[PDB]
Design a protein around this ligand. Structure first.
Ligand SMILES: Nc1ncnc2c1ncn2[C@@H]1O[C@H](COP(=O)(O)OP(=O)(O)OP(=O)(O)O)[C@@H](O)[C@H]1O
Ligand SMILES: Nc1ncnc2c1ncn2[C@@H]1O[C@H](COP(=O)(O)OP(=O)(O)O)[C@@H](O)[C@H]1O
Ligand SMILES: Nc1ncnc2c1ncn2[C@@H]1O[C@H](COP(=O)(O)OP(=O)(O)O)[C@@H](O)[C@H]1O
Ligand SMILES: [Mg+2]
Ligand SMILES: [Mg+2]
Lengths: 339, 46, 468, 511, 464, 50
């Protein structure tokens, strides 16, 4: 009986080797076939359309991460104060305010001890206000006085949080002036393209990210190499130059994508980093935006990132949640699914 | 007895696997085509 | 796409790569030391991914002269060693480079030294005695052909002499291939073994892979994997019986623990790495025979400070079919091989395999030696006169038995100046059956010291004035 | 077999779904830290690319520390990690009898798929203090020493603790083999289903154990959960819980289960490795602060359920390897505290020929006589005192002249009983045969026999009765007691056999 | 004002609260595990204030299935257990939840398990004897009212029957009550004890609190305090004399060590928690006599490696007042309770506490028994013939004494239908004085098994 | 390549050099001796151990 066991075991192991091989060559040939079939644009379009239908039939659902309750609430109060006060400010006034805020943030970053003293939480903000107005009233505007007083009065977990709050207020003022000019979409697209190209060439991004080197040289590098171009929005250029000027302990591409995220969130929308092997039709884009908005309720600003490696299909990531329709992902699942 | 049965089983198993490999080769294309057809949500005539 | 060295601390190097170019774990990376005196090419094995595109690597060569920021190249694969019949008769290092003929084997097929062990369904227990001619081994620790044999013991108890003896007795007439892995041992011993194999004409059939105790921890970690890869190729591709000799396997674990804290891992009990059992298990489980494919492996296992409870030998014990445990106490008595018959074990020492008579004689010998061990303290304090008559008779028998388990080995001729001997298993069983029955109680115990069979016993008794 | 793969491909299909993802932020030594996955549970099963599996053990605001259960070398920074929304669970059913599976319930014996009746989470709570009843049914190991001196009941946890090469696996395998007759009975109240968990053993040792079970026909009712030495620390840590889950599925359906853990010390080592790699605070012997909790929650799932829950039971036989016979080490101390009784095996006894090498002086069973049948209770009543007096008197072995008659008789009886408790390997004895042998020993029927012959005598006599006087065994088995008439018939049979018996030295054993 | 989980590492959970809502140390918090298979309400005990509004807590239940960010509710008080006469006859866990009847006692008065010992003034300067009524205990190892008694004994030695006997005597003689604290309790043994107390009809006089083996270390650490809180309510509020059983106290120490390790504290000598003495003292100082009422405690003690200098037993014995060892040898003789009169001891067996007559009688009994034990080996080896005539006389007297230390116990009635006896202390003293002097050596040995005072001895002698 | 174990016990009792023969050993052995010494001292260490 155990000899029968042994011979049946050898037979079954031969069977298993057969199955494993057959499966390996089968999946390889299937990959070749699909890649051959997906070369033509029509297959790409049809895959996108069917996946969009699948998303349409999908049912809806419900759902700054680094900051915490105190810091998040203080920043919310600061942005509300800005919305209230700087609403009537003029575009040139907005640029002046942004420049003053960036200069103040640079001063705080360079002068660590003053940042500590101004950032240490305190129930009574009167001393903080007194020191801030004593040191700044000389070289800032009244609206800047009010914004800085509001920021310092509130609470933050650490000094870096205060620096981030000041930079965020300046960036949001720049975005306010951008929307005032009516080119909000233009700056959105420019920022996203800049982030993508910066991610593509990590060498330049890392070179910029070195805060050890004086920031004037790096911002000049950005101006002459990338930010200085014919088709570059001036507002986006200024925002990116400011962001790189304040870079410290952060990598440039991450900062740029965060800039784009904040800019889109300024209108309340949520960015959906769509990925596909080819650009979609305008009707396809509208359908995608509508279906994603329905799924997540809030309007969604779809951003297309072409990547031929998906072999057709779409991959939509938003808020740490991903719907993966990529054909490459399906092929990987099929391969790993083999016995 | 079991030793002789096992050695003959091994050699005939090698022969059977060898002759099965060719039979598998002539039929893998259809299996791969069906896989690629159903993976894409649409039939591929290839 | 190349990385650059960020941190250098002894054998551990941190390397930063561009996003998306981070090498896979266990990949081989190359760095250059250009300082003239120590110029060389470092091979680094990726040990960890630290995040932010940094990898922590173990260097295979000393990092002296290495500089921060130097280019680091990724080979895209693990460390690989040459495989095939060509490796026979040649000496390699952990990286696969031939030492006797530098440049040899570069064109051979190369196999990665990292491999999964055989599937559980392919494992068949091995139960077949491998007769050696050593009385103690054949009687009380019968070795298994295609099984796993270990020689445990502390420093300087005869592990290497016994490994060389087993080479002489087994590999000298082996019909297959032999692989000797020198893991973190003396270079002088490696040279002596190379010369001995060349003289014995066994080298032609043997592949030697050496990583000495002067190598950095990475080389001592990976040399065993390299030799094991050669053995695995011979088992799975050439389809021939393989002899795998490893000395000393404990050095693999020791080298692993040397870098454990530099790799950031909190130490475990007795200073060992937390992953001792897992790394040992992977390596050991690769050292096995599979159905129809034989690897008779013989490992020397060093017992730190003679402490058999130490986690390294204790963890190793579970991986063996037969274990000859050498004792410092037996060594200090002049008994060689210094085997502790009460502590050694064999999985095939049962009536079903070795037979009723062999098992009976072995059990009787062990019982007598255990009783003698119990009576040692009484004899030391109160003297032997206070023992019962049967206890005195048993003590005499046990002393003669412990002396007779001693044997003059060929590999020991360099020390004793006395030629070795080989005792057939049947003669061993008959002789120890006679001993346990008291058939040799009239001979002086000195007649039983470092001899072969009963003929040698009669000769020595004649030389001492006795006669059987 | 091409049809086999054709069936899978024709049946294979995938569907996109809103999935929460993280990204591997670092990986080393079998651990992976993955950011994201905000809603991942503790102990949730995660899937990394290439079908790699991990368990989320360490959750903080930054990342999730995950133990990778295999193929860790495939883990890479930046890889996408998906949550499964499920804690560790394994399939369970009657299909697992005779199979070898890994701690995930996946067959590793190469005999095809296993039809799972259902799934069971590995961390389902043990039966409460009100869902149990007293352990009152014998679990016959077939080993005279255990069944007489440290009896095991159904639902008990009997630790088997000893140094290496003392016969712990031998004892457990003998128990499993002894369950063969109960299995053949066909009655679920008598049948015992066996689970053998192998942790950290080399694959060939597991193959040898499976071969031994095959020889005795035990694999018809035995399941092996194997986490060999090459397995990841995750499998070594989880295997006892997988075996316990299968056993619990049987236990909650009115069945009786015997689970062996060979051995829990290797599981403790694997868990310590995982905890140290996760930077959890180490304590004594570098173990985490909850290793005792590990083993205690594992072993409290072995229970005897009340009749309201079907009356099923699971008996635990954890094995512990001590070093230098130091039972005060950390893990031996914990497991000894947890269990109901302990069988201490010793190398010195083993080398003395005392096999199984149970030290009856220190071996205890807190359940005790409640786990014995009435006959065994009667015959085994005097064994404890007899053996204790024998060990007291053994210093006077050579001085029997100097001993009064009572002491010399005690010494001789003790030697006879020590020989009586000896048993060959792979030879479980039925309870009736054990009762008859112990009766021989404790009723003075071995006094006339030479010590060195006792064993053979015993065996031969047992073969005589079974051949000609099997009514004694019948009576004992069906009634579970030794009747007066059966006892008289047994005495007469013993005396006639003594008439027929011949000692090794040749002297008669009569009177 | 509710917190949220931020970190989970086994039973250790970090919880963040708003600024003004940080719970006080040892407060009980409630989180929820909603996963269907493992759904439960999780109890966390605040262990440390990490700062930045973060608290580190020990989970009283396994955290398996817990998610980051789930709400955590502060209950405003530490673990509180139900008190009152209603806890008698029921089984509770360390958190006060009734196990034999879930939801029972949820409306009772609830007391925090963290309480201080009686104020220095409130303590009784004079140590008092607890007259149990058992001859052996009263004579050789008198118990201290409000003190601590260590109990040592293997299996099958009457340990459970002795516990039942003490429950009976505290309930009947003193009109008191009992609380049993099973620290690291085996579930099988806990069920056995519950059923046995129900069968003995003494469960109504006992409150059982089980912290079982298969719970995280926090519950095993706090179960002793829970049971002690119930006993403290019975003493201070009900004005009763309580008997508190702890099995095993060493497991309370070991759970404390495990919790200390889980919290990252550096281990002290031999790996125990740095505050081992502080924790043991906080537990033990609450067991005392205050304002005319006492909690007396009998505690099972495990000695690691049989090393009495080990930190755990060394700290425990700093608080133990008496020791009672149960012997296999005595039990095998049929002497119940199977107390070892030589190994057992009491700290108050001094003339200054129990008087000179009691001390003299007890010392004489101990001397006679020790001499008999010395002669035991001779008797076993060479037989009683080799003994001297004075040796034979002493052996007979010692056998009669050792058999008169046996007693028909209250808890033994259910086994042997005969009811138990309660020998007054003076009666026992005089009876054993007479026995030692040699005024009963003519009577047969069997007449001394399982009887009360001298009247019962006379009756049993007449019956023979 | 071997060691000479010096013991204070042997030194005190007059054995100077206090080499503990039972545990002291040379891993080169006879190769490190001239032929005459190897001839007259082949088993000396084992003889003194015994
Ligand atoms: N009753 C017995 N009679 C004879 N030999 C026995 C007996 N029990 C066990 N042995 C033998 O003793 C040796 C050790 O047995 P086993 O491997 O079961 O013990 P162990 O303590 O589990 O060992 P290990 O540490 O290797 O896991 C084996 O050779 C086994 O055959
Ligand atoms: N069979 C033997 N006969 C005589 N001397 C021996 C024998 N085996 C070992 N020795 C002595 O003990 C020393 C240690 O042996 P070796 O095996 O090289 O060390 P280790 O046991 O540490 O590997 C040898 O160099 C030799 O001098
Ligand atoms: N006074 C007594 N009379 C009769 N039987 C007793 C007496 N004391 C103890 N026993 C018996 O001894 C056994 C002791 O077991 P148990 O009560 O569980 O204590 P332990 O926990 O020490 O074993 C009981 O089963 C009981 O039957
Ligand atoms: Mg060596
Ligand atoms: Mg074993």
């Amino acid at each position: 009986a155990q000899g029968a066991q042994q011979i049946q075991l050898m037979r079954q192991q031969l069977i298993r080797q057969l199955r494993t091989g057959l499966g390996a060559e089968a999946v390889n040939k299937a990959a070749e076939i699909v890649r051959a079939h997906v070369a033509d644009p029509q297959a790409q379009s049809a895959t996108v359309d069917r996946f969009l239908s699948e998303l349409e039939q999908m049912a809806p659902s419900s759902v700054t991460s680094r900051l915490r309750a105190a810091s998040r609430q203080s920043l919310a109060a600061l942005v509300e104060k800005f919305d209230s006060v700087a609403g009537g400010l003029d575009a040139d006034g907005l640029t002046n305010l942004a420049d003053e805020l960036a200069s103040v943030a640079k001063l705080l970053l360079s002068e660590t001890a003053l940042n500590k003293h101004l950032a240490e939480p305190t129930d009574d903000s009167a001393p903080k206000v007194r020191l801030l107005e004593r040191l700044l009233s000389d070289k800032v505007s009244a609206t800047t006085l009010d914004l800085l007083r509001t920021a310092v009065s509130n609470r933050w977990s650490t000094e870096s949080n205060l620096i981030d709050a000041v930079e965020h207020t300046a960036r949001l003022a720049l975005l306010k002036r951008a929307e005032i000019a009516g080119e909000v979409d233009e700056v959105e697209e420019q920022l996203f393209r800049f982030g993508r190209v910066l991610d593509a060439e990590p060498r330049l991004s890392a070179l910029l990210s070195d805060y050890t080197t004086p920031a004037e040289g790096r911002v000049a590098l950005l101006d002459k190499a990338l930010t200085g171009r014919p088709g570059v929005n001036q507002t986006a250029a200024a925002l990116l130059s400011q962001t790189v000027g304040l870079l410290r302990g952060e990598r440039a591409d991450e900062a740029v994508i965060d800039l784009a995220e904040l800019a889109v969130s300024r209108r309340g929308e949520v960015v959906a980093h769509v990925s596909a092997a080819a650009e979609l039709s305008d009707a396809q884009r509208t359908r995608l935006t509508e279906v994603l908005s329905r799924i997540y309720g809030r309007p969604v600003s779809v951003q297309l990132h072409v990547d031929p490696e998906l072999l057709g299909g779409l991959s939509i990531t938003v808020g740490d949640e991903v719907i993966d329709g990529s054909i490459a992902s399906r092929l990987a699942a099929a391969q790993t699914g083999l016995p | 007895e079991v030793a002789q049965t096992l050695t003959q089983a091994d050699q005939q198993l090698s022969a059977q696997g060898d002759q099965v490999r060719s039979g598998l080769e002539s039929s893998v294309d259809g299996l791969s085509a069906k896989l690629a057809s159903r993976i894409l949500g649409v039939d591929v005539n290839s | 796409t190349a990385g650059r060295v960020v941190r250098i601390t002894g054998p551990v190097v941190d390397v930063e790569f561009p996003r998306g170019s981070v090498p896979e774990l266990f990949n081989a990376l190359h760095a250059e030391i250009t300082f003239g005196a120590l110029a060389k090419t470092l091979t680094l094995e990726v040990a960890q991914h630290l995040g932010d595109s940094l990898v922590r690597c173990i260097s295979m060569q000393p990092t002296d002269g290495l500089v921060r920021g130097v280019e680091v190249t990724d080979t895209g694969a693990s460390i690989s060693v040459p495989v095939g019949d060509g490796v026979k008769g040649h000496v390699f290092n952990a990286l696969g480079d031939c030492l006797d003929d530098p440049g040899y084997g570069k064109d051979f097929e190369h196999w990665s030294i990292h491999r999964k062990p055989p599937a559980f369904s392919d494992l068949e227990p091995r139960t077949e005695m491998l007769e050696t001619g050593l009385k103690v081994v054949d009687l009380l620790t019968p070795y298994v052909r295609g099984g796993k044999i270990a020689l445990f013991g502390g420093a300087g108890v005869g592990k290497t002499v016994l490994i060389q003896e087993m080479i002489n007795r087994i590999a000298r007439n082996f019909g297959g291939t032999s692989v000797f892995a020198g893991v973190g041992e003396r270079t002088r011993e490696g040279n002596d073994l190379w010369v001995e194999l060349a003289d014995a004409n066994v080298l032609k059939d043997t592949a030697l892979v050496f990583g000495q105790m002067d190598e950095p921890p990475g080389t001592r970690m990976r040399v065993a994997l390299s030799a094991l890869t050669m053995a695995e190729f011979f088992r799975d591709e050439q389809g021939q019986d393989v002899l795998l000799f490893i000395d000393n396997i404990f050095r693999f674990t020791q080298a692993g623990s040397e870098v454990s804290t530099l790799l950031g891992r909190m130490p475990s009990a007795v200073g060992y790495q937390p992953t001792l059992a897992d790394e040992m298990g992977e390596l050991q489980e690769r050292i096995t025979s599979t159905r129809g494919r034989s690897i008779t492996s013989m490992q020397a296992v060093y017992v730190p400070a003679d402490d058999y409870t130490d986690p390294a030998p204790a963890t190793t014990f579970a991986h063996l079919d037969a274990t000859t445990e050498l004792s410092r106490a037996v060594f200090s008595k002049g008994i060689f091989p210094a085997v502790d018959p009460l502590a050694s074990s064999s999985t095939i020492l049962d009536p079903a395999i070795v037979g009723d008579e062999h098992y009976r004689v072995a059990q009787e010998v062990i019982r007598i030696l255990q009783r003698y061990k119990d009576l040692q303290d009484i004899i030391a304090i109160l003297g032997i006169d206070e023992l019962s008559e049967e206890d005195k008779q048993l003590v005499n028998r046990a002393r003669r038995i412990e002396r007779f388990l001693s044997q003059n080995m060929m590999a020991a001729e360099q020390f004793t100046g006395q030629p070795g001997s080989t005792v057939p298993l049947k003669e061993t069983i008959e002789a120890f059956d006679k001993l346990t029955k008291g058939e040799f109680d009239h001979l002086p115990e000195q007649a039983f010291f470092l001899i072969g069979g009963l003929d040698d016993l009669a000769k020595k008794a004649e030389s001492l004035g006795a006669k059987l | 077999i091409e049809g086999a793969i054709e069936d899978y491909v024709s049946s294979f299909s995938a569907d996109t779904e809103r999935e929460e993802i993280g990204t591997v932020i670092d990986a080393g030594d079998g651990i992976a830290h993955v950011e994201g996955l905000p809603s991942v549970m503790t102990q949730e099963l995660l899937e990394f690319p290439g079908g790699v599996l991990g368990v989320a053990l360490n959750l903080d605001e930054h990342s999730v520390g995950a133990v990778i259960l295999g193929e860790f070398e495939k883990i890479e920074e930046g890889q996408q990690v998906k949550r499964t929304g499920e804690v560790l669970s394994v399939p369970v059913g009657d299909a697992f009898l005779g199979r070898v599976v890994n701690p995930l319930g996946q067959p590793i014996d190469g005999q095809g798929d296993i039809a799972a009746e259902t799934r069971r989470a590995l961390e389902l709570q043990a039966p409460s203090v009100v869902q149990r009843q007293s352990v009152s049914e014998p679990l016959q190991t077939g080993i005279k020493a255990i069944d007489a001196m440290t009896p095991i009941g159904r639902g008990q946890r009997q630790l088997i603790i000893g140094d290496r090469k003392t016969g712990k696996t031998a004892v457990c395998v003998d128990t499993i083999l002894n369950q063969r007759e109960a299995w053949l009975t066909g009655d679920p109240k008598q049948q015992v289903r066996c689970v053998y968990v192998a942790i950290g053993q080399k694959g060939t040792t597991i193959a040898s154990v499976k071969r031994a079970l095959e020889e005795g026909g035990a694999m018809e009712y035995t399941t092996i959960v194997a986490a060999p030495a090459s397995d990841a620390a995750g499998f070594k840590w989880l295997a006892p819980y997988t075996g316990s889950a299968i056993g619990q599925h049987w236990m909650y359906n009115g069945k009786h289960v015997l689970i062996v853990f060979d051995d829990l010390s290797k599981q403790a080592d694997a868990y310590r490795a995982i905890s140290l790699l996760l930077r959890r605070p180490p304590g004594r012997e570098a173990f985490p602060g909850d290793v005792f909790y590990l083993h205690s929650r594992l072993l409290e799932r072995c229970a005897k359920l009340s009749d309201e829950l079907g009356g099923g039971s699971m008996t635990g036989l954890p094995i512990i390897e001590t070093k230098a016979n130091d039972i005060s080490a950390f893990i031996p101390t914990n497991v000894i505290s947890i269990t109901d009784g302990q069988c201490f095996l010793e190398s010195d006894l083993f080398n003395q020929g005392v096999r199984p090498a149970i030290n009856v002086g220190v071996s205890v069973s807190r359940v005790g006589g409640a786990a014995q049948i009435k006959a065994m209770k009667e015959v085994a009543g005097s064994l404890r005192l007899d053996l204790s007096q024998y060990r007291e008197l053994e210093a006077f072995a050579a001085f029997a002249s100097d001993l009064d008659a009572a002491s010399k008789a005690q010494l001789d009886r003790g030697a006879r009983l020590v020989e009586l408790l000896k048993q060959p390997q792979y030879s479980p004895l039925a309870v009736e045969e054990q009762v008859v042998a112990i009766f021989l020993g404790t009723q003075g029927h071995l006094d006339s026999v030479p010590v060195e012959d006792v064993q053979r005598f015993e065996s031969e006599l047992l073969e005589h009765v079974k051949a000609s006087h099997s009514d004694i065994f019948d009576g004992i088995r069906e009634t579970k007691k030794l009747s007066e008439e059966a006892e008289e018939k047994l005495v007469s049979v013993i005396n006639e056999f003594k008439k027929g018996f011949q000692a090794s030295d040749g002297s008669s054993v009569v009177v």
